[PDB]
Symmetry: C2
């Protein structure tokens, strides 16, 4: 670079591919280094669509790493024009298939000694999301905790997860392979930023959490990280994976919907289609009317996933693993306004008993008549079986328990029973700035802004208590990243966060009040979902 | 010659006896015959009215107990012996008892008629716990209790046959009812104010009188304590009754219905008793061999159907349960349970126990029961498992059938009051883990704690007086609340599901009688049994 000598010497870094120049960003407490839009793969475009990522080839000169890159091609929610509750999750950069870039935040100047690395994997149902969203801003953890934080884009929707299992051209799970390639990039290069490749903690929410779980369950990924955090998502459960037959079914149907016919010719025809056509048709291939079900998700391929996640967590040895797992207070509430008759964000969504039964059929699409009746039985308040408020809240609880809370309880149980050190939480604080109605409680995904420390930015109008709270959570998360223990070794005054064990089943509540220890994560109910009901899910 | 002790009934003259109650004297007329003795060829047959007699019939003493199995699980133990026959066994047993105030009531008095329980195989009106002198003296009530045939003698049935039609124990009860209608006024009783009350099998009996049209002109109100005509144990089908009768016949060497029954009538009573427990279809508890049969006569249909389609608009009903309905029965057949230790069982024993307590359960149903009653925070804790086993039996056999009955009756016009009885007698000889077992509210209802020699506590005496007041208020008005007065006891309704707790503390109103769990038993599980 001819202008290197006139520029900030503290923002120049070399990695395997070549030289990069980052940017000095302002965090409330001081500056941070950001290296944004670093390519970790060759653009998965044209003939590379549906294919595993190829490592980015070295470049000449100085790569401009000062701004976020393109967002992977995806559906954009336009249900509520101008509504913050949806818009804050929408892409904030141009959509492109050329999207395999990652981002790095570090202290400014960069750390002098090797520093624990946090790697964020975003959620969004495997059909959406971006590492560039404001809610995933790494600057606060970097400045306040001194963390090195990395986040990557990975392909979503058909581009990431359309599969014709067994084929060469569309093997499936390539979004997960994008994630893995980013993990390898970190292993080779993070030391140049002052990061410690021997202390890497994965964390993610929802589909990002399911992703993290799948890296736990896939051997080639295991040498690429040391600890994991799963927020409101699991590799097990009803939505995070499909079987090979179902993947093939869905891919074939989509292909027919966009006008395409041997796997090779089908896939080639698909590769001739515009990205937006694939996006425009991906939602028409689900087998039933449903919520919290996504068309193109990880597939049990016998490769990346050697078996079903339930099998793998049932037979796995997790002795050298420390994991942090948890849920928010109202996991199911959000999804109700997206397909259950009678629900809306703009009224109180008080429903009738008929609407509750129908809603149970939509939320548990695999339930036989008997299974559905059993769910209705368990969740009805038989003292007030017609009360619209109880029915609304019960609908929410059915969806949240089925898709998140009980799969999390199941995971935590299996991991703890088979060697892993497990910490469990429930997140119960509702953001003062939330624009979703009060009846939705603490919805899916609204702990994230507190983990990343956004309330520390005064311009965002959080309360003082919320700033303190955020600082607490940042401390828990980075403590866990550093030591595999969220507790402060110096702070014996504060209540301790005990490990989750099958014997005591202890977890903690995260809210404005000090840590409270509780026992049994929805134990009766999750026994219902995880032990009794699985036989009967067939319709 | 005490004229207060000489009474003329339709059959002739009776001489009673003056008894001492704590507050004063009462008149007792004990061992009054109300039927021809059901002996010889009258075995298994409907009762015939007692023929008139000459002179003055001695009614100063309890008559014989109807022939029945005697419990020998714990010989000499009060907890069991207080339920055993306290007079001689005889098939010559169809007698009733009357308690009245001394002197005989000036104006017509509400009548309370007790029907004892004991699984339709046992029981007697002469037991100390059914002593009517306290209610008669304190509340001024006229109390009647009758002996009725039990076991094979009262319920062995060959449906369709002339000689053993079934339900003749219920017919014994009915004949005693019609006797009260014809004769009770001579004792100062009001035949237009008659209240049936009974516990367990007695409660189920009361229920069946509610559901049998000819019984309905013979009473006006009913109390069902820890039992119901609906449910898994109170009735059998005609086919199953016939099966059990034929098997019992086989076991005693008998041999066409006529000749089978003839041969059965040749057998000594103790033969039949000796073999009655060998005809149950499965290993079980809270199941009894010879019980009321759905005959299409006394019971025109199943009790479930009848409570579902019945019109109960002019009926007032008091129903309830005790805190631990299931506990007593565990020591009578569930491995790992005993009165002499704390019965801390294992999980395997819990599953097996569930198979015994819910014998009709498919594997799926049993797994569902295990799932529902397991404390998944402590799935192996012996104490939890034991208490859970108790709850499974109590809920399946009593609590949830009671909830269903109360709900149906309420929904279809009846005035219903409901309770849960939660006080453990200070004198109870069963172990503490059994809590408030099946049947241990009776002694308080009958007012036994008012006898200082039985050494109950002062508070228990006050409690007994409260309950006697509730029951006789209900008998008098169809409302347990004091007609003038203390939180009010609200009627049970399907919408609010209110019931009260009966204990040393003042009335507390609660809502929903094990609502989730009884929804599980009454709505979900029946398909899978």
């Amino acid at each position: 670079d001819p202008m290197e000598g006139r520029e900030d010497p503290q923002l120049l870094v070399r990695v395997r591919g070549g030289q990069l120049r980052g940017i000095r960003l302002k965090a409330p407490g001081g500056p941070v280094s950001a290296f944004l839009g670093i390519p970790f793969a060759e653009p998965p475009v044209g003939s590379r669509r549906f294919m595993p990522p190829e490592p980015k080839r070295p470049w000449s000169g100085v790569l401009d790493a000062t701004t976020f890159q393109n967002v992977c091609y995806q559906y954009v929610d336009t249900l509520y024009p101008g509504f913050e509750g949806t818009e804050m999750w929408n892409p904030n950069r141009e959509l492109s298939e050329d999207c395999l870039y990652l981002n790095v935040w570090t202290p400014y100047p960069r750390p002098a000694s090797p520093t624990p690395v946090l790697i964020w994997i975003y959620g969004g149902g495997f059909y959406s999301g971006a590492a560039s969203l404001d809610v995933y801003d790494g600057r606060f953890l970097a400045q306040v905790e001194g963390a090195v934080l990395v986040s990557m884009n990975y392909r979503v929707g058909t581009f990431g997860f359309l599969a014709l299992p067994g084929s060469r051209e569309a093997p499936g799970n390539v979004g997960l392979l994008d994630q893995r390639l980013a993990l390898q990039w970190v292993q080779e290069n993070i030391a140049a930023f002052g990061g410690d490749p021997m202390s890497v903690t994965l964390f993610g929410e929802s589909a990002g959490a399911a992703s993290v779980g799948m890296h736990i369950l896939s051997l080639p990924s295991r040498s690429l990280f040391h600890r994991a955090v799963l927020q409101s998502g699991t590799p097990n459960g009803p939505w995070a994976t499909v079987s090979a037959g179902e993947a093939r079914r869905r891919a074939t149907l989509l292909a027919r919907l966009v006008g395409c016919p041997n796997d090779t010719e089908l896939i080639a025809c698909l590769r001739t289609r515009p990205a937006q056509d694939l996006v425009d048709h991906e939602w028409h291939v689900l087998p039933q009317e449903s919520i919290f079900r996504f068309s193109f998700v990880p597939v049990v391929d016998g490769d990346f996933l050697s078996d079903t996640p339930e099998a793998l967590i049932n037979t796995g040895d997790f002795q050298d693993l420390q994991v942090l797992v948890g849920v928010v207070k109202d996991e199911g509430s959000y999804f109700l306004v997206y397909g259950v008759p009678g629900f809306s964000k703009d009224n109180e969504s008080l429903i009738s008993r008929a609407q509750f039964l129908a809603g149970v059929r939509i939320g548990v699409p695999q339930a036989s008549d008997l299974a559905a009746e059993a769910v209705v039985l368990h969740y009805t308040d038989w003292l007030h079986p017609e009360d619209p408020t109880h029915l609304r809240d019960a609908m929410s609880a059915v969806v949240g328990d089925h898709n998140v809370v009980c799969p999390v309880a199941q995971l935590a149980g299996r991991l703890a029973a088979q060697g892993a050190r497990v910490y469990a939480y429930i997140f119960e604080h509702r953001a003062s700035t939330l624009t979703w109605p009060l009846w939705m409680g603490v919805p899916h995904g609204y702990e994230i802004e507190f983990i990343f420390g956004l309330p520390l930015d005064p311009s965002l109008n959080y309360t003082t208590e919320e700033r303190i709270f955020a600082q607490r959570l940042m401390k828990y998360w980075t403590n866990f990243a550093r030591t595999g223990d969220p507790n402060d070794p110096r702070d014996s005054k504060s209540p301790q966060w005990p490990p989750y064990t099958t014997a005591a089943q202890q977890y903690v509540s995260l809210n404005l009040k000090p840590l409270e220890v509780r026992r049994g994560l929805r134990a009766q109910t999750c026994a219902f979902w995880n032990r009794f009901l699985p036989k009967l899910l067939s319709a």
